[PDB]
């Protein structure tokens, strides 16, 4: 089976007797089993890019091939796991080695063996039954939330020769046996998939439903669809946690995957410390969010190939959960750190530089990753839908979007929540700059809003216009002062102030703003814009009259409605029923209508 | 256990090529194996195997290859990579870049033989930085407080006093004192006079019992400059993660390390990456710097300050740029303050201790610290803006409040940033100086501070 | 219509053959079947990226921004498969599309394409941010064959003159806008203020058009005159006195 080391130079290990080896095959080098990829073949010889430090590898050392390219073990026991970028299990490395270090050349099986999982076979199946890739042949109760749908691997097919009865089985127990063309395949709960290959689908559907974040600016003005591709300018001064924690606690995705792309050592431990302590309410129980996520963490001194692979590992996990019919959300907290790892591989391969020193294929390696998002009809027969949403942060130096990883990312992602240090310094959380930010999914979500929130598309359009008018009017205020504006424009600044101060801002540490349902979000904006339209009608109806309405008259005779329009943020879906909340909003609409009717 | 088998020794030098010596007929060489060359006159030269292929071992020799030949030269192969002879008795001592001593003391009686290359600290085991290290300098400790386990460079430029700053940190650094703290000081690429400065300054001023000092001279072998950080961090990992010490690892010029890594890369005939440095420098630099942090179930924690001479004064250069990507923050030495004779010339405005919010406050230092530091930063920023305004409009056009930010600015540079090379200030003394400056303003002008903190600390 | 789709995750070397397959179909339909063919090639930037990736893998001599030194010839091997041919009623029209990287007109993808193609149609953020669909910026735009596919039997007589005067007025409008940004509108003459007002009225009526609104060339020229009528007749320095006498007052 194995070859022998012929030469070593830095991480490059040339091996011989490798006549059976394949391009990008995964190889273990040396007596310590150091990981590496074959980057060239030259006869019976192979050149291996060893990931880990090769110091101590010798000529004549064994070179053991795995029968596979770089691949992710998929199966039960992912939830709660922590992985490096190449799927090695950092929690289990810790518990087995009892060391603060990863030992060079770990061989710990990625999904923990020996855990007998509770398995229920898919009760419709029988010996002699037909089956195709993506058929759910049984369910594993790995945690309370995520019933793990075991499925036939996408390339496997045939007739079921055996299925295991209900019972407890570990990942190496043969749960299914099937036959095709007279050839038997024995099959386990563990499933191996090539990480740089897209898990296939019945069809990638158009994305049409909101990925609700529970955050007013993010859900109202810049919506991301389930299946959406999005970016965040993740940098310290902007408060990036406001999105990622809110998504993690509240958002309407059944599973989450985190990729530490290549983050600073201490910033990595913040993620790994924090998430275990976060919790969600499910069916009125409180449970740790680690019940529904896996953290593919990588510090900056993890192997280059692990950082470059880490993004592809996280999406390959996310695609397995998508194929279980779950909606995954995938956070990628610095695509720039991944692009540096990619640049280092290209540099070590002695390839020619392109834009700003990045490789030629940076555009393709980004685009072919973001195209792994979307809603799908899964493979296999229970017709189930699912999705992956990719929330891939960017880190343009000095905020300069001309940086090729940032520019190519903004050339691909349909949504960009442009967090800004100027807003974060003012504590305007969630700190999203609404002038910078955008979403392309507005058109595709019209179906959803038409069915469920039919007035909201008008309100969203009016809100964006009022905010744009605030920035335009602010130039006139800076030139000639607020006193010089028309009455319409003065009330436009007052409503834009309410929108900026009490709609778009949301302090997630407060019990009332921990989350914000879409109905609460619509009701708030409906009242602010109802006030805007009634104030604007009162002003415009009294245009060229003797007695004329103005912001000061409105504030004098109905400053209570201005106070209520701010106060509506404090309403609490936990303490207040939906009917109570909706009724208070309806009462404020009636109150403001009577109040304006008393003037004009 | 150990290498029980004897070393082979080869006269079979097939050639020499700059700093390389090309052995042939070699039995099963290891990549990065240490070798001991002997010249025809009997002089030893140390080297490391830089490449292996079949029977061929490419030795990078540390010293020059002068005197090497194809017949009388002999090369002993040690069968193993370079292991640091680590021990706690490396504190109170001075070593050259290879780890041989230069303080007239004996060779290190190793408590262990640790591979210089280290290993990745398992991310599950890493703990968030959550208490302060005092550095003694007020422009750090009061403004950019370093959390124990933070990585944070001092950026500098050619000719600025960053070595005197690093020396002062080495002397003054320690815990908060509301016994088990050590500096490790990797002095890479240091000219002879500056090496004598560090050695003398730490020996003289009582510090040695709590520092391990590594000196690599500007004319020492370029590969020993590469070994020196890896050697220092391997010692710091021994002191922190096995002997439970808190450790502050100071690296004195990462630019001289980048200018060494460039040579080892050129030695393997690797094509240069961006600006002539090896493309993989991000990983090598990370593999240095990330040997830092607190860890699960241990008290020990490596904090680090990589000093870094920005080439051409420029932050866009890959050396500072990569350091700013790996490290949590930065501190700037400034030519303007230096020319003004303000020592230490640390500029507070572009500086940022990324972790400071977990080094400071109640229990860790004093409850006011963040409020003080924010307000001092704001008053120095507004003071610089008002000083520029005075130069445009004249003093008669300034308000009373402008004259307060300007009097604050003058007193701030003379009392807060200025310190002199041997005045040691606690965090507590720095905050009390902070209040003596903030007291210049009316209570209401201190807008970033909470009214509770003003009621407890605005009185003097 | 025939569609060739190479998706952003499909193997990047197929992008090299994708437009070549499309052209080879267009050549069959035009040059053998006498169809009047239009070829659309979408993101020639993704084609040029495939050339850059292949060039890196081959180790070709690099030109600008790491594209191969032959990028002009390869782009010509795509683009020059266009035009009418003697004895055939057929024709291949092409309207390629490309995303200019970082908006840079001097980037090798637009620049070599600009050398090979018969003028170019430009789309701009300075129109799109103001919601001016379709966001076509006339000023950098030209069509080399407009110097023939106009005038009697093809279009109204005035067309060439109207086009040139609209170009002059829009260009001067941009220049006085650049003056206003330094010295303010109080330094502009009444004539200069009319070119700034022209630039506003022009974008609001000539460029602005609905996504399904279809306008004839003759309708477009009547809009052109209704905009040119903003200036006094004597200022229309690109239009001859005969064309003014036949069309200016109408």
């Amino acid at each position: 089976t194995f070859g022998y080391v012929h030469g070593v130079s830095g991480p490059v290990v040339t091996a011989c007797d490798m006549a059976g080896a394949a391009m990008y095959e995964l190889v273990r080098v040396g007596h310590s089993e150091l990981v590496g990829e074959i980057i060239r073949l030259e006869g019976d010889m192979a050149t291996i890019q060893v990931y880990e430090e090769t110091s101590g590898v010798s000529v004549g050392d064994p070179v053991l091939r795995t029968g596979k390219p770089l691949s992710v073990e998929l199966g039960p026991g992912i939830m709660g796991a922590i992985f490096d970028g190449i799927q090695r299990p950092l929690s289990d490395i810790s518990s087995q080695t009892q060391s603060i270090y990863i030992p060079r050349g770990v061989n710990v099986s990625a999904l923990s063996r020996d855990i007998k999982w509770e398995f229920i076979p898919s009760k419709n199946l029988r010996v002699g039954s037909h089956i195709t890739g993506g058929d759910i042949y049984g369910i594993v109760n790995e945690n309370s939330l995520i019933k793990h749908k075991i499925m036939l691997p996408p390339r496997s097919r045939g007739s079921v020769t055996y299925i295991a009865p209900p019972g407890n089985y570990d990942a190496s127990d043969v749960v299914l046996e099937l036959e095709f063309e007279g050839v038997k395949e024995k099959l386990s709960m563990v499933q191996v998939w090539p990480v740089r290959q897209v898990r296939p689908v019945t069809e990638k559907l158009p994305a049409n439903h909101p990925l609700l974040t529970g955050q007013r600016v993010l859900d109202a003005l810049f919506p991301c669809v389930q299946g959406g591709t999005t970016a965040i300018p993740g940098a310290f001064g902007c408060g990036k946690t406001v999105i990622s924690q809110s998504l993690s606690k509240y958002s309407n995705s059944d599973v989450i995957i985190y990729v530490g792309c290549g983050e600073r050592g201490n910033e990595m431990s913040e993620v790994l410390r924090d998430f275990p302590e976060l919790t969600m309410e499910v069916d009125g129980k409180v449970e740790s969010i680690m019940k529904r996520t896996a953290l593919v963490a990588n510090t900056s001194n993890m192997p280059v190939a692990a950082r470059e692979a880490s993004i592809y590992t996280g999406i390959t996990l996310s695609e397995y959960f998508r194929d279980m019919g779950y909606h995954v959300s995938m956070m990628a907290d610095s695509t720039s750190r991944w692009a540096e790892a990619l640049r280092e591989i290209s540099g070590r391969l002695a390839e020619m530089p392109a834009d700003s020193g990045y490789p030629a294929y940076l555009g393709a390696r980004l685009a072919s990753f973001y195209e792994r998002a979307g809603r799908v009809k899964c493979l296999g027969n229970p017709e189930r839908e699912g999705s992956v949403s990719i929330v891939g942060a960017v880190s343009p130096p000095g905020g300069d979007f001309s940086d090729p990883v940032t520019s190519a990312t903004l050339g691909i992602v349909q949504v960009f929540w442009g967090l800004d240090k100027k807003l974060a310094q003012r504590k305007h959380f969630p700190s999203v700059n609404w002038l910078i930010s955008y979403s392309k999914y507005m058109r595709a979500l019209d179906e959803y809003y038409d069915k469920h929130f039919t007035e909201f598309v008008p309100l969203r359009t009016k809100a964006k216009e009022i905010l744009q008018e605030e920035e335009d009017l602010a130039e006139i205020v800076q030139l000639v002062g607020k006193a010089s504006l028309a009455e319409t424009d003065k009330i436009t600044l007052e409503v834009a102030k309410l929108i900026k101060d009490d709609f778009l801002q949301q302090n997630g540490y407060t019990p009332y703003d921990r989350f914000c349902p879409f109905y609460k979000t619509v009701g708030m904006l409906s009242n602010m814009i109802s006030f805007y339209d009634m104030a604007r009608r009162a002003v415009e109806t009294t245009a060229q009259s003797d007695n004329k309405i103005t912001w000061s008259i409105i504030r004098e005779h109905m400053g209570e409605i201005l106070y209520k329009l701010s106060s509506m943020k404090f309403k609490d879906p936990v303490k207040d029923g939906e009917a109570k909340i909706k009724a208070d909003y309806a009462q404020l609409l009636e109150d403001m209508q009577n109040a304006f009717r008393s003037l004009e | 256990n150990y290498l029980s088998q004897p070393r082979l020794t080869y006269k079979t030098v097939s050639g020499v090529n700059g700093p390389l010596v090309i052995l042939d007929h070699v039995k099963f060489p290891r990549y990065a194996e240490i070798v001991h060359l002997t010249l025809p006159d009997g002089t030893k030269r140390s080297g490391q195997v830089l490449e292996v292929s079949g029977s061929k071992a490419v030795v990078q020799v540390f010293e020059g290859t002068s005197g090497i030949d194809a017949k009388k030269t002999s090369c002993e192969f040690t069968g193993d990579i370079l292991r640091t002879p680590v021990s706690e008795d490396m504190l109170g001592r001075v070593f050259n870049g290879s780890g041989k001593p230069i303080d007239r003391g004996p060779v290190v009686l190793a408590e262990d033989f640790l591979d210089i290359m280290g290993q990745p600290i398992n991310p599950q085991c890493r703990i968030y930085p959550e208490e302060m290290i005092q550095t003694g300098i007020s422009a750090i400790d009061g403004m950019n407080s370093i959390a124990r386990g933070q990585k944070i460079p001092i950026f500098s430029a050619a000719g600025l006093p960053h070595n005197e700053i690093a020396a002062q940190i080495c002397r003054q650094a320690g815990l908060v004192k509301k016994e088990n703290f050590a500096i490790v000081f990797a002095a890479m690429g240091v000219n002879m006079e500056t090496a004598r400065f560090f050695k003398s300054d730490f020996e003289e001023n009582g510090s040695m019992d709590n520092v391990c000092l590594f000196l690599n001279l500007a004319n020492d072998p370029t590969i020993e400059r590469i070994i020196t950080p890896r050697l220092a961090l391997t010692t710091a990992e021994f002191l922190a993660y096995q002997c439970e010490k808190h450790v502050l690892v100071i690296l004195t010029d990462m630019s001289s390390y980048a200018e060494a890594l460039r040579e080892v890369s050129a030695a393997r005939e690797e094509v240069p990456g961006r600006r002539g440095f090896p493309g993989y420098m991000y990983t090598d630099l990370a593999t240095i710097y990330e040997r830092a942090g607190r860890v699960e179930g241990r008290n020990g924690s490596i904090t680090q300050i990589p000093i870094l001479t920005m080439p051409n004064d420029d932050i866009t250069h890959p050396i500072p740029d990569l350091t700013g990507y790996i490290t949590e923050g930065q501190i700037y030495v400034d030519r303007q303050l230096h020319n003004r004779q303000i020592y230490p010339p640390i500029n507070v405005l572009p500086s940022l201790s990324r972790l400071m919010k977990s080094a400071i406050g109640e229990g860790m230092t004093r409850k006011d610290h963040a409020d003080v530091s924010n307000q001092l930063y704001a008053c120095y920023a507004i003071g610089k803006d008002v000083q520029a305004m005075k130069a445009v409009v004249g003093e008669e056009a300034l308000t009373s409040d402008d004259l307060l930010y300007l009097e604050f600015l003058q007193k701030f540079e003379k009392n807060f940033i200025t310190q002199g090379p041997y005045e040691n200030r606690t965090v507590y003394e720095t905050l009390d100086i902070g209040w003596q400056l903030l007291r210049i303003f009316p209570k209401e002008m201190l807008k970033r501070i909470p009214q509770s903190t003003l009621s407890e600390f605005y009185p003097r | 219509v025939c569609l060739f789709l190479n998706l952003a995750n499909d193997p990047t070397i197929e992008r090299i053959i994708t437009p070549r397959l499309a052209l080879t179909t267009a050549e069959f339909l035009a040059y053998q079947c006498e169809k009047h063919v239009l070829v659309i090639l979408t993101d020639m930037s993704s084609y040029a990226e495939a050339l850059r990736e292949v060039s890196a893998a081959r180790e070709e001599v690099p030109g600008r921004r790491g594209f191969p030194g032959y990028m002009y010839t390869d782009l010509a091997t795509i683009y020059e498969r266009a035009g009418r041919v003697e004895g055939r009623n057929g024709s291949i029209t092409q309207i390629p599309i490309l995303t200019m990287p970082n908006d840079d007109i001097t980037h090798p993808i637009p620049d070599l394409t600009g050398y090979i193609t018969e003028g170019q149609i430009y789309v701009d953020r300075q129109l799109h941010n103001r919601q001016i669909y379709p966001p076509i910026n006339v000023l950098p735009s030209l069509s080399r064959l407009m110097k023939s596919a106009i005038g009697e039997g093809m279009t109204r007589k005035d067309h060439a003159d109207v086009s040139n005067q609209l170009y002059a007025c829009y260009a001067i409008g941009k220049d006085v806008q650049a003056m206003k940004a330094v010295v303010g509108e109080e330094a502009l003459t009444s004539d200069d203020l009319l070119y700034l007002e022209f630039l506003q009225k022009f974008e609001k009526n000539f460029i602005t058009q609905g996504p399904y609104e279809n306008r004839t060339v003759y309708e477009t020229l009547d809009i052109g005159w209704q905009l040119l009528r903003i200036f006094p007749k004597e200022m229309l320095k690109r239009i001859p006195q005969s064309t003014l006498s036949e069309f200016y007052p109408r």
């Binding site: 002695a350 020619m352 530089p353 | 005939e269 094509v271 240069p272 990456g273 | 180790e59 001599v61 690099p62």
Partner: peptide, 23 residues
């Protein structure tokens, strides 16, 4: 970069040829 890379490839060819010339 491209010139230095092409030089490095020619050197590797010359080394390989020089070893083949020993046969």
């Amino acid at each position: 970069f491209y010139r230095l890379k092409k030089i490095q490839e020619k050197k590797k060819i010359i080394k390989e040829k020089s070893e083949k010339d020993l046969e």
